Amino acid sequence: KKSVAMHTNYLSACSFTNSDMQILTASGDGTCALWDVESGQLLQSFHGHGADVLCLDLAPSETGNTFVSGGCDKKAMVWDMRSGQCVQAFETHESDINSVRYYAFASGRLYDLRAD
Amino acid sequence: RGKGAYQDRDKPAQIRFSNISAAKAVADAIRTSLGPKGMDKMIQDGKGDVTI
Amino acid sequence: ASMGTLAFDEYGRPFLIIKDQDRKSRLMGLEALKSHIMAAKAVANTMRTSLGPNGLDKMMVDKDGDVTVTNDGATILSMMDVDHQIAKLMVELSKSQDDEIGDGTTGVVVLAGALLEEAEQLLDRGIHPIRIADGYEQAARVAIEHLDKISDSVLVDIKDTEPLIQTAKTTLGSKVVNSCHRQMAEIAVNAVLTVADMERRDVDFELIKVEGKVGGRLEDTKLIKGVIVDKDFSHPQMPKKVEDAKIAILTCPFEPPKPKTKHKLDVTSVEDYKALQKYEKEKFEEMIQQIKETGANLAICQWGFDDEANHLLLQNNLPAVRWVGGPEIELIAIATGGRIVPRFSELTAEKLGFAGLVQEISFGTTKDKMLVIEQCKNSRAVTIFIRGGNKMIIEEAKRSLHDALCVIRNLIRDNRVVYGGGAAEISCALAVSQEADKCPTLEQYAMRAFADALEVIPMALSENSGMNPIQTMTEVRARQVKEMNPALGIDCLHKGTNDMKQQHVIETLIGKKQQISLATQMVRMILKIDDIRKP
Amino acid sequence: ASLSLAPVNIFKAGADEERAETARLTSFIGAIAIGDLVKSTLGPKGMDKILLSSGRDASLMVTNDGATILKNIGVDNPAAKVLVDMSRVQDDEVGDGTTSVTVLAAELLREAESLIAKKIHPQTIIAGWREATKAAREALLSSAVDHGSDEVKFRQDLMNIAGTTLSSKLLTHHKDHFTKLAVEAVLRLKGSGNLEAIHIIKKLGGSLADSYLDEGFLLDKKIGVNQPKRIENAKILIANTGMDTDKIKIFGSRVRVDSTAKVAEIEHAEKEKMKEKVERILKHGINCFINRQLIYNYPEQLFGAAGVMAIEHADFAGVERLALVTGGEIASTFDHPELVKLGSCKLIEEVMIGEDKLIHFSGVALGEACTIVLRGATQQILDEAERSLHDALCVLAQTVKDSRTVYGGGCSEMLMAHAVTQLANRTPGKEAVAMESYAKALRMLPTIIADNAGYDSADLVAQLRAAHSEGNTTAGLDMREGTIGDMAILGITESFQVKRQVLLSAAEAAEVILRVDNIIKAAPRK
Ligand SMILES: Nc1ncnc2c1ncn2[C@@H]1O[C@H](COP(=O)(O)OP(=O)(O)O)[C@@H](O)[C@H]1O
Ligand SMILES: Nc1ncnc2c1ncn2[C@@H]1O[C@H](COP(=O)(O)OP(=O)(O)O)[C@@H](O)[C@H]1O
Ligand SMILES: [Mg+2]
Ligand SMILES: [Mg+2]
């Protein structure tokens, strides 16, 4: 097992990426983190989203480059590995999104990426 | 002339005194462990770890 | 009079009719009407202090602690946490007025409250509420006919926008942007006129993008005949400014093609691996060359792309931006005159949009960048970029400019205006008063009460401006009766004259008609209700 | 009647409502409390604050910055929220003036409370304040002086502005050294406004005077194992490629064979692909290689055998800064060596700063990116030094953008207030009283500046007012001894943009808060 345990705060969700090479983690401070299983280095930490993240979803058709994160900011915001930026965000949710399902993705309100 | 500024607010003086008191307390706490005749301290963490 | 009924039978046996009837409340008859009238009066009296140029603001705090300082009545009532059902009816009435017109969301509540306040003393004298509602409907019909009679027409030509500017200024005069009043009116009028189906058809607000960023000043708010995006050039080393850009809009990520169906590509030999690697490299090179062959100077995607495509775009002098949203893609395509191409193989020169200037804009010591597309040929989309000293005034400016755009849209739909400042209400009250003198006396009380309720707007305007309400209203009414001039209103700004024609206080006739109609129907419903059965 | 004071209750449980008296009272109390809290940290003799977090981390920080003080406080008063947002937006627009704008808004709202007590309608106050703001802005613009033509005069103005900005912070101990530091750092940007190109490294230990601006660049990354640790006349190649189990982006591809010999052959083919990638990179003729992403063991040993120093995991900011300082191009394909330019520097080596090892780029080609090393006795000292440098660099960059300068030390406030008083003296009605209160708040600003120093604020303010009314338009407070003097001679200058923004934002927020006559709260979730 990886059992890395490099984390100052607790882990709301530790979602293993679809690519069998790296893991995606989000701490209790609302910042997501990407770790390489082989090397162990933290590739990049995602700022913003001040309240703690609560769900992590990678892209379903492999494509280990984009993911969506939601937490207590009542936000549904999408990232990108190749730039480390919030490429897309949503505002419909208003209460501490618990779990998110990737279809577009349904979170608890079905969002569509092609039309925002 | 005579009297200068009144300095109505008393909080800054209290803050300075409290800061100095805390620093002096820390210095007095660790004074006993100074020099070749100084002696060690045993510190027990909340988790139960013990360090001398 | 409350809790329902409690009998437990005349034989002592249990008498249960409705589930949980012991913990359910009930109001019957006239007391329910009085409670509803009192609640509506409270709501209207809360609203009336934010009416007119001298009206004050309400500072709304939601459940999360976010603060919204605003003057829009519809916004205030929407953000107001009420529990009384009649208050919810008032909130829905304000929302209805906002949806139908966009302006006058505060006048409707005051008018309905005045109508119900008069209906209270009418009910106290033993008149059936249905008769009061019928009299109110008759008086509302008379007032609407009088408004149509005294209405005046304005020209909605693009060559002469002065009446439109004056109407927008009148709309904005009660908001916090009255410091930038004329500039705000100018940009609202130009934004509406730039994007509008000229043959008196609809105005599509989807093509008016209102964006606000903190910093700067209110005077820095400007109308941009293009699209403002919250993105930037993907590679940090591409130029920040492109002139005479030939824009290529794409919705295909600059990645190797991927079938939608579940697909597995089998590699069974070293030659297969080499062929796949060469296929990847050639796909990247071919897509970049296809983009370049059309002669485009700037490429816009929607789904982002990877490092190889980014460096190829930089290497070939092709500035590009990625992850542009769908609505922003549509706006860019509309403004630049270019089509949206779903894949590189369909990208031709004729599908390229054109922009006179594409620039990246900094915002001081904030690291944030925004893309600007403007100087198009015949751009059919506009962007209003609002700057301010804090987010709260930015939101207020957003809703104020929305009010101005809605008013100009109403002018587009119908070009008949009525002079405001209480002149319209006073003239309608006078018309109702003359009509009531000929009516049989039984509906006369309802019609006179309707006239008195209509007279509340000039009183509220006078009281907000510090003038004595009754004296000012009586003087203005006497002047209107003496000299036939339905343009005399309340001098809220103390300009020295009571004539709103020279003061250029202009209101759309459609707005006043909608106000009167909606208030009358809501009052009719509230009068028709006689029971409440809350749990 | 009233929404709350009615026989029938129209609200949910927990919802509240405050009418004119209560709304104005709460707004004024919140604004005045915020202004009093943030003040006393104003002027050269201002003091710092301790911000103790109540959370699990219990983060500790000492600061003189108004924006950071207002950010990290639990605020329930909505008007206080308005002022906090004002301070944050002021910080975003320009680096300084966060405390001044908040104090000005608080004083304006206090004067508004007095005027309301004097039975003056708030609309009249707002109109008078709009007129006063227009007059004060016109006067301040007319007083502005531009030195952007002469290079020596502009450099002197930049030095004075940096010194004035740093005078109120903890860096005032070594103001001269830190002023030289900030001016050199900003001038090295070659006109660009990119403040992210200046990297501040905080290393514990040493004195605060040990801080310095590196003549080249410093990177906090590591070198590979077998790669050289020292390169002279480096040929930099900055990349953003994979170099880590680099897989074909055809994610539907898989290896499906009938024997392990074919699997071994495919593995050798993958290794050969990586070797060919490294050979293509090396064909550029380079001595150093910086990749944004990770570099795995096989490319690491290939670079080591090639005798090329390869730096891995230099983040987006890192590769951008290296591109800015060395002139290289961030590449991702290496099929065209002649179309990619390479960064260059005289020497790269490893240096020790405290107990950590960093990579040093010396004799850089362009140098449009700076690394400032901060040495301090405590973490709080390092954080405050970083914040003070941020303020100084932001103000210097704004002055580079717009070279117009105005005199500080209360001179601009006195001039604007004198103009406002002149306007009010010729205006009839209560608007004159409103403008007089506006000018009174403008006076109160340097009054607080002098009070923080323990001086005789009343006498100094009276002398400044008399001098400005006489015609001495450059008179200002002299905090060295506590008299008045010529700000032009004494060299207290400020960015015209900063004071204009402070005045306009303060007036705007005061008008926004004053317009409120009712506060309605929804039921909180808790
Ligand atoms: N310059 C003015 N002079 C007199 N009355 C005005 C003036 N500007 C606006 N009003 C009046 O103020 C009233 C309120 O308008 P406003 O507050 O902008 O929107 P709402 O009608 O939703 O309250 C309008 O009925 C209008 O007649
Ligand atoms: N050397 C100086 N002499 C006189 N006044 C000064 C000097 N340095 C700074 N000030 C004044 O101190 C005021 C407060 O600046 P400061 O406390 O650094 O942050 P802020 O500008 O955000 O309030 C400025 O308005 C400036 O006029
Ligand atoms: Mg209106
Ligand atoms: Mg300062």
mmCIF file of C-alpha atoms and ligand atoms in Angstrom, chain C residues 72 102-106 170-172 174-175 403 407, ligand 3:
data_model
loop_
_atom_site.group_PDB
_atom_site.id
_atom_site.type_symbol
_atom_site.label_atom_id
_atom_site.label_comp_id
_atom_site.label_asym_id
_atom_site.label_seq_id
_atom_site.Cartn_x
_atom_site.Cartn_y
_atom_site.Cartn_z
ATOM 1 C CA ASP C 72 -34.480 47.444 -5.876
ATOM 2 C CA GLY C 102 -38.029 45.415 -14.765
ATOM 3 C CA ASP C 103 -38.818 48.795 -13.195
ATOM 4 C CA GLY C 104 -41.432 49.849 -10.681
ATOM 5 C CA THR C 105 -40.938 46.857 -8.376
ATOM 6 C CA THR C 106 -41.251 49.200 -5.370
ATOM 7 C CA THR C 170 -35.055 58.909 -14.873
ATOM 8 C CA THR C 171 -34.837 55.172 -14.203
ATOM 9 C CA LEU C 172 -31.331 55.459 -12.724
ATOM 10 C CA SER C 174 -33.010 56.607 -7.591
ATOM 11 C CA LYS C 175 -29.920 54.361 -7.567
ATOM 12 C CA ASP C 403 -33.202 48.218 -14.656
ATOM 13 C CA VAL C 407 -36.663 50.256 -19.380
HETATM 14 MG MG MG E 3 -37.527 52.884 -10.968
#
